[PDB]
Amino acid sequence: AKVCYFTGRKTSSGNNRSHAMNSTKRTVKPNLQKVRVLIDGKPKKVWVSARALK
Amino acid sequence: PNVALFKQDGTQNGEITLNEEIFGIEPNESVVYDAIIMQRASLRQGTHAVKNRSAVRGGGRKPWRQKGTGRARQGSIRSPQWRGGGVVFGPTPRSYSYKLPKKVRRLAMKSVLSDKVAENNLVAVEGLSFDAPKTKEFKQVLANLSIDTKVLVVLENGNDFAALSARNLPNVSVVTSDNVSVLDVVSANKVLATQTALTQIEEVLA
């Protein structure tokens, strides 16, 4: 998904070397989860990372 | 050396003494030539440019194929041979200015002044004064002093009433005692200078 509603994790990109550093491109998406949570008392549905779930 | 003295009519009072370490030095020559060329050739303005192949408002589409027409091969409308193409190795903006060792400057000034005194051309005047800047009197000042050729005037400091009458025929040109340069002496024949300006010169020149 796009972002986290609470913090600002977002997708990005970096290379990927393999045993002879042939450089290509990759994607690093942040772990994300859809959960129903309270906002103003109105339960929403939104993306929250699995690192702000403690 | 020794030089005579006059005021504007009071003619031939006692003389004046000047040291031999500055005004008697049997001038070197190559220094003078080189300092003249440098000083003068430091007055340029390098502002001049020219468009070249990648700057002309042209295009990179070939005229036509590489073959077929039997014609010669061409890469771009705009290019050196075509009329209306870029230039190869045209003039760009540059600098032209450059300095010398610090000693030869002083040797040059000393040599110039010693040369001019060597032929009785420094005329030491006592003191010039004008209440108002009346141009006509200046002419009479020189007429009394018998200086008609191209001349140069050295003044002490802001006694401007003696400079505001130096927009004469260009036979004269005015300058204080802090800006005496090489050219502004070599270019002239006779030189006028008050008595205080002489000492002031003999200060800055150590």
Partner: protein
């Protein structure tokens, strides 16, 4: 010397060499370059030291050495530099210098023993070659590692 009579110092200005202006200069039609070959295109020539194909010299022989991170080299003044401070002046690695003798004391001033001194100075520096102390105390000076 007057404006309209300038003369440069003789033999002090050459002329130029503009190449490729006609077969009489001697440098037209291949601009003093000869026939074909990659020495004769625009911007030809190989990099420096390259050698065709041979393994060049700098790879034919081995690497050696390292560099101590904290070496200290001094600013040696031998013995005759001292021989102008006639008799008693407290030579010092300081405003002694201040005379056009030794600027940029690298890591303190050394003193050496070449080649002959006849004075009675008093020397203060940061090291001494064993023969130098003998020369100083031979003419009867002093020393101090200060």
């Amino acid at each position: 010397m007057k404006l309209h009579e300038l003369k440069p110092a003789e033999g002090s200005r050459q002329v130029r060499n503009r190449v490729g202006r006609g077969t009489s200069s001697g440098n037209g039609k291949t601009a003093g370059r000869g026939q074909k070959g990659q020495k004769a295109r625009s911007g030809g020539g190989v990099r420096l030291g390259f050698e065709g194909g041979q393994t060049p010299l700098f790879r034919r022989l081995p690497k050696r050495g390292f560099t101590n991170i904290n070496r200290k080299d001094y600013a040696v003044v031998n013995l005759d530099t001292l021989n102008r401070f006639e008799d008693g002046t407290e030579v010092t690695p300081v405003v002694l210098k201040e005379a056009g003798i030794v600027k940029n004391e690298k890591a303190g001033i050394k003193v050496l023993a070449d080649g002959e001194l006849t004075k009675k100075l008093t020397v203060k520096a940061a090291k001494f070659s064993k023969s130098a102390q003998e020369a100083i105390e031979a003419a009867g000076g002093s020393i101090e590692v200060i």
